[PDB]
């Protein structure tokens, strides 16, 4: 409603770096807000794509940003009569970024990994890796829970059980208020998908460079399954956290598996021990229900509510014809210990192939009316198909069925305006929470500042 679509702010990265593929707000120890941006196709030293991260200071003018430097060299360690190998070529560093405290976590879901022993190998596969940094101190660390030293032969002899070779850890990411990192690994356990959790403190204190294979004792990985419903489900395509069990001391995880149960799609809510509390099933096959998830109390009862995106949902129209437009589902948490019922609201896109629901960002209370609001992206929506972001306001009964404001892409066609979003942070410190929008197709980020309500 009260975002400013006239005077925007533009940050930009290198051409063809997909600058803006992922982003987040970052507050230093002094409380100064910045914008971290992932550019998963940024060139490295060997003039090859490796990805990269940028830490943009807040300036109303915008402009170029300084790199947040990480190690981009391929590593090798001959140890235990084995040879450990990491390959960072086309790893996609910055394919996801998240900030917590004065710490930044940027991940390369496609960092490859192999182990050699004489003539055998563990196979060169994308286990993924996460790079962590404390900019003010310069401290660095890594986390790659899916790395292993098991040989190809063993996996075959054990019928490919607990195969973490393709985890692609860092695909999605989130951090609990307690400082516990949680990585979605859609390729884990042979493309079933897994989650990997570990305290940020324990990551830094257990990491040393050159080791490549090290133990993080406090970590916690989810489990393999014999159930075909989970096969090729990409469990961990998206991840979020919240409070859904009434216990304020426990933290619950929200996981998206958009191809769960033969492309039906699903979202699961779990305790910190990965025991399932709820499961939301997709309404339509191949809709990619669970492509994106968001957690925020929209109706002001102090109970978190769940939003789920199905960007490829095909709406039923006249003459038995369908039209891919995307859809968003709202699930309001009930009072006390009860199961999340049917969707409280269905928001459906209008533009064909617009992919409404590709991204969903909590805005906090935008108009300051007392109910938290959200922003939904249709990256190829709008009349021009250039992309749109739609704002929906909270209310006593959930959300408004109609948008209060629509942000048309200021970029050219193919910019994927809205593919990444983030809100609920006051960046100019005017008392109103603001919205940052990524457009990797254009290698830029747009900042929308919230003003007083007209």
């Amino acid at each position: 409603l009260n975002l400013d679509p006239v005077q925007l702010t533009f940050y930009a990265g290198p051409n063809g770096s997909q600058f803006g593929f992922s982003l987040d707000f970052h507050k230093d120890s002094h409380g100064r807000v910045a914008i971290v941006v992932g550019a998963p196709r940024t060139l490295g030293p060997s003039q090859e794509e490796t990805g990269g991260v940028f830490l943009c200071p807040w300036r109303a003018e915008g402009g170029q940003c300084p790199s947040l430097l990480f190690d981009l060299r391929d590593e090798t360690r001959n140890v235990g009569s084995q040879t450990l190998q990491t390959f960072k070529a086309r790893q996609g560093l910055g394919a996801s970024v998240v900030s917590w405290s004065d710490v930044i976590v940027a991940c390369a879901p496609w960092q490859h990994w192999n182990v050699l022993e004489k003539t055998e190998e563990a196979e060169k596969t994308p286990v993924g890796s996460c790079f962590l940094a404390q900019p003010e101190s310069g401290r660095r660390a890594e986390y790659s829970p899916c790395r292993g030293n098991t040989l190809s032969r063993i996996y075959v002899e054990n019928d490919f059980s607990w195969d973490k070779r393709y985890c692609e850890a860092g695909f999605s990411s989130v951090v609990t208020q307690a400082g516990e990192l949680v990585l979605g690994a859609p390729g884990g356990y042979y493309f079933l998908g897994l989650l990997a959790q570990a305290p940020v403190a324990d990551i830094f204190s257990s990491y040393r460079p050159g080791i490549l294979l090290w133990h993080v004792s406090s970590q916690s990985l989810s489990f393999d399954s014999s159930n075909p419903e989970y096969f090729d489900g990409y469990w961990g395509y998206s991840v979020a956290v919240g409070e859904f069990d009434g216990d304020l001391n426990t933290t619950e995880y929200v996981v998206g598996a958009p191809t769960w149960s033969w492309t039906l799609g699903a979202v699961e809510i779990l305790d910190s021990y990965y025991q399932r509390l709820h499961r939301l099933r997709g309404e339509q096959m191949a809709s990619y229900f669970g492509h994106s998830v968001a957690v925020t109390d929209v109706n002001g009862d102090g109970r978190h509510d769940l939003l789920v995106g199905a960007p490829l949902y095909m709406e039923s129209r006249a003459d038995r014809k369908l039209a891919e437009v995307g859809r968003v589902y709202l699930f309001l948490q009930p009072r006390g210990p009860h199961a999340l019922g049917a969707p409280s609201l269905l928001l459906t896109g209008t533009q064909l192939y617009g992919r409404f629901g590709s991204a969903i960002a909590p805005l906090g209370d935008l108009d300051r009316d007392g109910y938290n609001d959200i922003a939904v992206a249709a990256p190829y929506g709008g009349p021009s198909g250039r992309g749109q972001v739609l704002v929906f306001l909270g209310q006593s009964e959930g959300l408004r069925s109609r948008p209060s404001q629509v942000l048309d892409s200021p970029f050219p066609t193919g910019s994927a305006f809205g593919f990444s979003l983030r809100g609920a942070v006051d960046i100019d410190d005017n008392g109103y929470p603001d919205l940052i929008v990524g457009a990797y197709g254009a290698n830029q980020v747009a900042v929308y500042r919230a003003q007083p309500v007209v």
Epitope: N78, V79, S81, I154, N158, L213, W214, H215, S217
Partner: antibody, heavy 119, light 108 residues
């Protein structure tokens, strides 16, 4: 806190067999490798072998192939070292070892188990 | 197997002295080495891993260094507790192998 609590001192005859233990405390035995090391005053320290208690796969120094047999039961959180066809040279102190962070290191040590073979 | 020649076998030194134990491998081991401490009539405690990294709880007066096949353990300002046995261990290859050992003794 990590502590490796091995069995008490054993006292056996030659030709017999013995099975030591190494119970984990403050952690899960399954997390890391578990090595066994032999110590004598003259010959010094020697590496017997290792095991990954998560799957039971083992490795041995070809010197101890036949005498040493390393195993583990994740249930009791314990790792074992069986010795067979004992002799006077097997008279030594035996330690179980696991790494701290590095997958391949040798950092945490149990108090040790004294063995004496004699008729 | 890889041999580990640890030297010296022993040394007579006093409190506050700075000393250095060395270790020579039969081939390159690229910093894949660990240092150990066995106090008289007791078990072992980890000091170093991967050549230079201090084990948790270990004072910073200890320090590891070296590369290739030559490595060293240095103790700045000897404490009364530091008088004990020390061993180096390589894990570049299986089987793991240890050094002959080094014993620190009080000089007089």
């Amino acid at each position: 806190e990590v502590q490796l609590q091995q069995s008490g001192a054993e006292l056996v005859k030659p030709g017999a067999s013995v099975k030591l233990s190494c119970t984990a405390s403050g952690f899960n035995i399954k997390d890391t490798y578990v090595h066994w090391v032999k110590q004598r005053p003259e010959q010094g320290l020697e590496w017997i072998g290792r095991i990954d208690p998560a799957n039971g796969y083992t490795k041995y120094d070809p010197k101890f192939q036949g005498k040493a047999t390393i195993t583990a039961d994740t249930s009791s959180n314990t790792a074992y070292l069986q010795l067979s066809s004992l002799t006077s040279e097997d008279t030594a102190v035996y330690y179980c070892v696991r790494p701290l962070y590095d997958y391949y290191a040798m950092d945490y040590w149990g108090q040790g188990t004294s063995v004496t073979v004699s008729s | 197997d890889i041999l580990m020649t640890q030297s010296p076998s022993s040394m007579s030194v006093s409190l506050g002295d700075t000393v250095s134990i060395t270790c020579h491998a039969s081939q390159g081991i690229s910093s894949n080495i660990g240092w150990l401490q066995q106090k008289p009539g007791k078990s072992f405690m980890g000091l170093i891993y991967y050549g230079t990294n201090l084990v948790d709880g270990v004072p910073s007066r200890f320090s590891g260094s070296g590369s290739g096949a030559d490595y060293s353990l240095t103790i700045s300002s000897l404490d009364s507790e530091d008088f004990a046995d020390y061993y180096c261990v390589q894990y570049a290859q299986l089987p793991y192998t240890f050094g002959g050992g080094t014993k620190l003794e009080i000089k007089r």
